[PDB]
């Protein structure tokens, strides 16, 4: 209901099989992305093109193990409702170990050369979902939810064209000192 | 004579079949300079580059014509249809082969024409839209002589279903099938679009219209119909963005 | 998601009705109503809601509000009936 | 000098250029020199006025709206009061321009806009106000102002031009389409859905213009009529098309009205009459 | 006989471009090719 | 042509570029070519509109005040009567511009000012006056005029521009900060004192503008609205910053109001919903 | 670490994943000297050469094992399945990636083994045959711990479902997933057959068996199961003889 | 392993400690071209260039975070503090070393971030200022989990005490202390200011924030806290304008 | 394609400068250096 640090923590549960971790649409100037640096700079422009860099950092105990599959579903198909559907598109099987961070690129996958930064059906960017590949296994003496941190950024091939005002901040009265 | 062999398919023509290549441009794969999508494209083999024959229409003395939309007409054709449904993006040229044979006693003239971006008009007026199911009929296409339907396009061939006059449709790449002269028409269509590649499902790049101009006049006592058969082969087809199979209405 | 008001209306033959199209999207690019009837967009501020005076309704019609908003159903149909 | 016709005498040609087969769909370039004995003439003509840049390339009035300068105290709907007005930019609302553009499937151009504001004071007025108009180009999908003195007008990003009523503004807008060219015709949908709109697409969004009179109110009401003139320049056009024959009914659709009058003139006489 | 200085940094600001010299209607009038000379790629 | 993506085929790499450690605080430049087989595409793009000069570089209305031309005989407080008005220059009063600037810690720019004066005569008037506005830039800390016809207006040193109402003035002011850049954020005090103000500093003093109508009074009252537009040019920006999420409450402070609404939109559905 | 990227798919492993290549032979396209079928083969693009993940099995303390048959397990997997159904002949290698992670407190050992021509025995004796539906289960495979079915194979893992002893199954290309050591196994399978190419539907070239050898022993109080996930990518796949889509039972 | 020895101080790390150098700029002495103050600067020896350890904070399951301001946190640290009080002007870089060790059973993630010009917001709204005593707390810093005070800053870590969202704080130079991966974070801070040198007392150049992002989850039965220790070494420190010792409040 | 004459003596009077060619994000994206290669002065 409120803005919390917990909004940034993607919960992972132990002993979940063939299950979904998270799923989101890829309207970068909206939804979960609206407040990120990428989304904020994106809302100042009307058009965007290029690839996105999506990262996940595992924060659970060192003695845990998990294989996740992060899937990008290009536009034209619904958000995947099962892992089988998800793994037919662009995906990365991530084995959590000494390297706690996976970096999946969302390749620019579009016919039209530019997409609208504001949500639009024609210029839809597809879907992003994460699923349990094997499962999460916690060591003994540990219980509860472990968390993933998801990061967003732009690849060096990113483009932003047509300047516009941002709808993030508003005013009805002039400010003073 | 002429023979075109694509994959495991062959069309032989005892007419000196001269092909129209729309705008003197052969189908080509998307070059790097024009590409925007970064994924390596899927360029199918013999499996798709082959002649698919659609079900034949019957040309009667009072038939108005038929309209197919590509790639919609081939959405259920072997491996091409599957690839079109499994990939997010696709571009393709076409070799269209319209066939209609008769005797030296028959008369009639078909206009075979390819219209890029043949946006259909609605018969209801105002700002009504033609529904998806009508603009994506499939291999059966649109029969211009049938009656109007709720959400269907207008079907007065005089106005090309778009508010332009039929006589002027020769500005588009076309061939006539004049029963005295020839029985086949061949048009090679390149990929035509404002974007380098596009979604094959929601957008029809071209429309193939076969229109009787000079009506069919069969000899006395003859059966008052002729079959018209359309054969299409995808050419320089590319697919990108493989994922779960798309779900379209009908 | 796209919405139309009223959901349904019964009106006398040849009369006018006000149909409202709305979106959940705050800033839609396409927002209108598809109908063969003569219509008049009421001067109204904002981007995500429109009002049309659909005039001279003669038959049963199904005006569809449309938009490009990707949340939910991007189209909504209302049902006009005539009594005479 | 470019030759229009070459000298040509009697011809007993076996390569008959006048017998062909239109079944092939080619317009073989048969010249007067092929069917009649001709003299040699020169063109004296470059065809500068038939180039698409010129054919589609003069300023045309593409929108007209009236706005008012009046006391705004105690009004809820400023848009209804005509204190301001916005307009999604389109070159389809004027039929001459639309038909010319619709002669092609894809068109790419930069836009030069000229806005002419003219004031009228129908009711009793003691003088003519020195009013200033704000024409705000809002990018595609950006929020339009909701009231006459909304903060949207003070946008730090939206291009705005301030000019006196009775005078003009001029500013160019580059080609702003997402695709390599505008789709003057689109045979598709925004996505694979059973009920979604046909033809009309967001690919051809050229922006929008909002207009208000910046001045506060005088004692009298001033009616300002804003005429937007669009001139296409650096024009590129592809895929010639059959010209429009029937009236239009809506923007972005090829629909024509039911029960339209015949286009082809009927002959005063039979087919043999001159 | 004629002079233009560009006063603005944007290409969209320049006046009209003029005439496309190389105009050739064979794209539209002569689009026929024999398909037995293997012109297809 | 700058390459956006290179052709890349199957990869059995042991130098896994997609496994990293964000614990280090580096955004390793992982490209699409690293996780998927790619084709070769080109940028066709320079990023001219994302340069800070363009991002922070169009004219925005940064102050609006109304002044009056009326009979000044028998008035003690001319400022209260709105015969003149002054304003300490700041780009913080408009939130769009403030948030854009606050994306950086230090900003250096020259200022181009455009002042638009528009006249209104709400009460009965026989005609529209030909008024002249004086916009006086007063250097930081210089005395502002205290009455409408004070001798401060006849300053032999303060830059002043005289222009007709309904028209504009334009003049540039160089970067006038004491330090090498403006402190859009200042985590300090003017001196080591227990009670002194925090954040707001004299380092960012850009001057002040005083406005009056030079004309003596007519028989009627004329209301003049002055809009000051600022355009930053020759912009240099340092130290990118977290964007502003909450409303502002004052100039020069990062304070936000109590009981503010949540910034992060709540999801319509659980974390798995698309 | 290791990363294998096929098409739009990527498997990352923080284990130094060493791959077994069956019989030190990489998958290869059929050479001319070995070819009999004359048709030009269809060699799909990224569209098929990619990792398909099967649904995960749960490894409990009393589970006997699982068996998948290729290419049957991939008959419903994106474009590969469609091509397998539309063509008369097909040959393909495979990169099998079996994944099973646990903690340093778990113990257990899986035998991941590839058996060419794993002809299954019937549990009924005599000369009864195992029915098509049981030898072509699909992505679910055969669970050796379930009960017998009429026409199904025998399911005593000790005898490999074929009358040979389990201990001897190491003669085939295999890898162990020892929970103390590794969590993934990778086997690259070439096309193995007495004929250069064959029908993909009626014949299963290889069988993938994942067998618990050392039983799963979870730490005290732990959930007594682990998921096992199989990921397969067709390699050097060829198809020949495109025609109407085959009709198989179930 | 790694060892950093400054003066008579040494920090050893059995983690491969990778250091973040803010904006890829090492601390440097003020060059002549940038200098305005004419006095020859005082560049202290080993006496100041050394690691000062601040008192440790306890990281509990419900702790919001901590904030230190430099050079305020070191104003009472040996010779550096004295020089900072005796001179009118000063500039300095810093090597910050945040230390937090746990077992392989703990989970949690600290965000260690350096914010130049971290102007704090007041919790009262309007235009109230945060008083000197609160923005110059010293080696104890600001604890974000404590309650508000009259004249103190706002302490909602979600908004960074300045009205910006926490998620976006990665634009600043930062390192995470992920208990599964690493136990130390090292950030090298150069002198950042619009002026070449400044008063060390009235202005805090940077703010060090240590924020729990992923909450501390200790193993069952474990003590529900971890100590966090901050170690700082001034780097390329300069002082100018020696005079009577400054008098500051508290 | 473009021309500018400076009409005023002050640098502050010139129009905007244009684009900063040499743009490189590694300052912000790759600020990590090993401190065991003695990069510090």
UniProtKB/Swiss-Prot annotation, chain C:
> What does the entry say induces or represses the expression of this protein?
Up-regulated by coagulation factor Xa (F10) in atrial tissues. Up-regulated in atrial tissues by rapid pacing resembling atrial fibrillation.
Residues forming the Ig-like C2-type domain are 14-76
Query: Which cysteine pairs are joined by S-S bonds?
Result: 21-65, 25-69
Tell me what PTMs the record reports for this protein.
Monoubiquitinated, which is promoted by MARCH9 and leads to endocytosis.
Location comes to: Membrane
Q: Describe its partners and assembly state.
A: Homodimer. Interacts with MUC1 and promotes cell aggregation in epithelial cells. Interacts with ARHGEF26/SGEF. Interacts (on T cell side) with CD81, CD247 and CD9 at immunological synapses between antigen-presenting cells and T cells. (Microbial infection) Interacts with major receptor group rhinovirus A-B capsid proteins.
Protein's job: ICAM proteins are ligands for the leukocyte adhesion protein LFA-1 (integrin alpha-L/beta-2). During leukocyte trans-endothelial migration, ICAM1 engagement promotes the assembly of endothelial apical cups through ARHGEF26/SGEF and RHOG activation. (Microbial infection) Acts as a receptor for major receptor group rhinovirus A-B capsid proteins.
Q: Which family does it belong to?
A: Belongs to the immunoglobulin superfamily. ICAM family.
What is the name of the protein in this document?
Intercellular adhesion molecule 1
Give the encoding gene's name: ICAM1
Please tell me where this chain falls within the complete protein, as first and last residue plus total length. 28 to 111 of 532
Swiss-Prot record, chains E, I:
Protein name in UniProt: Capsid protein VP4
| Subunit field text | Interacts with capsid protein VP1 and capsid protein VP3.
Organism of origin: Human rhinovirus 14
Q: Where in the cell is it found?
A: Virion
Q: How is it modified after translation?
A: Myristoylation is required during RNA encapsidation and formation of the mature virus particle.
Q: What does this gene product do? A: Lies on the inner surface of the capsid shell. After binding to the host receptor, the capsid undergoes conformational changes. Capsid protein VP4 is released, Capsid protein VP1 N-terminus is externalized, and together, they shape a pore in the host membrane through which the viral genome is translocated into the host cell cytoplasm.
Whole-protein residues included: 26 to 66 of 2179
């Amino acid at each position: 209901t409120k803005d919390e640090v917990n909004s940034y923590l993607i919960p992972l549960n132990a002993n979940r099989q063939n299950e979904q971790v998270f799923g989101t649409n890829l309207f970068i100037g909206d939804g979960v992305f609206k407040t990120t640096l990428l989304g904020e700079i994106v809302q100042y422009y009307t058009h965007w093109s290029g690839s996105l860099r999506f990262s996940l950092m595992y924060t659970g105990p060192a003695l845990s193990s998990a294989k996740l599959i992060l899937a990008y579903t290009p536009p034209g198909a619904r958000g995947p409702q099962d892992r089988r559907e998800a793994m037919l598109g662009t995906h990365v099987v991530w084995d959590i170990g000494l390297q706690s961070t996976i970096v999946m690129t969302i390749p620019w996958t579009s016919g039209v050369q530019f997409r609208y930064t504001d949500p639009d059906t024609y210029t839809s960017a597809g879907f992003l979902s994460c699923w349990y590949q094997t499962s999460l296994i916690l060591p003994p003496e540990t219980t509860g939810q472990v968390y993933l941190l998801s990061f967003i950024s732009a690849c060096p091939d990113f483009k932003l064209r047509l300047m516009k005002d941002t709808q993030t901040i508003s005013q009805t009265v002039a400010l003073t000192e | 004579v002429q023979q075109i062999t694509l994959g495991n398919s062959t069309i032989t023509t005892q007419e000196a079949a001269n092909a129209v290549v729309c705008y003197a441009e052969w189908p080509e794969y998307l070059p790097d300079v024009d590409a925007s999508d970064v994924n390596k494209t899927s360029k199918p083999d013999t499996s798709v580059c082959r002649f698919y024959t659609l079900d034949s229409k019957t040309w009667t003395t009072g038939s108005k014509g038929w309209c197919w939309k590509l790639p919609d007409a081939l959405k259920d054709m072997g491996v091409f249809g599957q690839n079109m449904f499994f990939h997010s993006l696709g571009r393709s040229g076409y070799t269209v082969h319209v066939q209609c044979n008769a005797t030296k006693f028959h008369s009639g003239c078909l206009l075979v024409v390819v219209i890029p971006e043949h946006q259909l008009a609605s018969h209801e007026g105002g700002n009504v839209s033609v529904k998806y199911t009508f603009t994506h009929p499939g291999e059966r296409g649109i029969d211009l002589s049938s009656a109007n339907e709720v959400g269907g396009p207008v079907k007065d061939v005089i106005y090309n279903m778009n508010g332009t006059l039929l006589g002027n449709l020769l500005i588009f790449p076309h061939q006539f099938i004049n029963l005295r002269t020839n029985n086949t028409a061949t048009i090679v269509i390149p990929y035509i679009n404002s974007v380098p590649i596009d979604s094959m499902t929601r957008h029809n790049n071209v429309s193939l219209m076969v229109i009787p101009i000079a009506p069919l006049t069969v000899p006395t006592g003859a059966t008052p119909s002729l079959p018209i058969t359309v054969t299409i082969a995808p050419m320089c087809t590319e697919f990108s963005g493989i994922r779960s199979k798309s779900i379209v209405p009908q | 998601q796209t919405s139309v008001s009223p959901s349904k209306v019964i009106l006398p033959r040849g009369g006018s009705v006000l149909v409202t199209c709305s979106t959940s999207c705050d800033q839609p690019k396409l927002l209108g109503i598809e109908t063969p009837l003569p219509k008049k967009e009421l001067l109204l501020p904002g981007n995500n809601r429109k009002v049309y005076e659909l005039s001279n309704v003669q038959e049963d019609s199904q005006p569809m509000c449309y938009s490009n908003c990707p949340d939910g159903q991007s189209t909504a149909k209302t049902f006009l009936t005539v009594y005479w | 000098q470019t030759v229009a016709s070459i000298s040509s005498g009697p011809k007993h040609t076996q390569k008959v250029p006048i017998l062909t087969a239109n079944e092939t769909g080619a317009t073989m370039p048969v010249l007067p020199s092929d069917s009649i004995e001709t003299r040699t003439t020169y063109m004296h003509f470059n065809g500068s006025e038939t180039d698409v840049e010129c054919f589609l390339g003069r300023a045309a009035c593409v929108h007209v709206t009236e706005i008012q300068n009046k006391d705004a105290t105690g009004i809820d709907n400023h848009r209804e009061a005509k204190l301001f007005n916005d307009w999604k930019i389109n070159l389809s609302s004027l039929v001459q321009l639309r038909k010319k553009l619709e002669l092609f499937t894809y068109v790419r151009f930069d836009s030069e806009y000229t806005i002419l504001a003219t004031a009228s004071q129908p009711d009793s007025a003691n003088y003519s106000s020195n009013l200033v108009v704000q024409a705000m180009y809002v990018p595609p999908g950006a929020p339009n102002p909701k009231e006459w003195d909304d903060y949207t007008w003070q946008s730090a990003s939206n291009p705005s031009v301030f000019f006196k009523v009775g005078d003009t503004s001029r500013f160019s807008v580059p080609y702003v389409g997402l695709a390599s060219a505008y789709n003057c015709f689109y045979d598709g949908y925004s996505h694979d859905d059973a009920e979604t709109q046909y033809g009309i697409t967001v690919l051809n969004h050229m922006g929008s213009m909002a207009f208000r009179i910046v001045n506060e109110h005088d004692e009298h009401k001033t009616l300002v009529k804003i005429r937007v003139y669009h001139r296409a320049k650096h024009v590129e056009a592809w895929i010639p098309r059959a010209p429009r024959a029937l009236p239009y009914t809506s923007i972005g659709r090829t629909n024509y009205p039911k029960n339209t009058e015949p286009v082809i003139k009927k002959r005063k006489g039979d087919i043999k009459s001159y | 006989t004629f002079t233009v200085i560009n006063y603005y940094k944007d290409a969209a600001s320049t006046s009209s471009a003029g005439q496309s010299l190389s105009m050739d209607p064979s794209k539209f009038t002569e689009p026929v090719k024999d398909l037995m000379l293997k012109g297809a790629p």
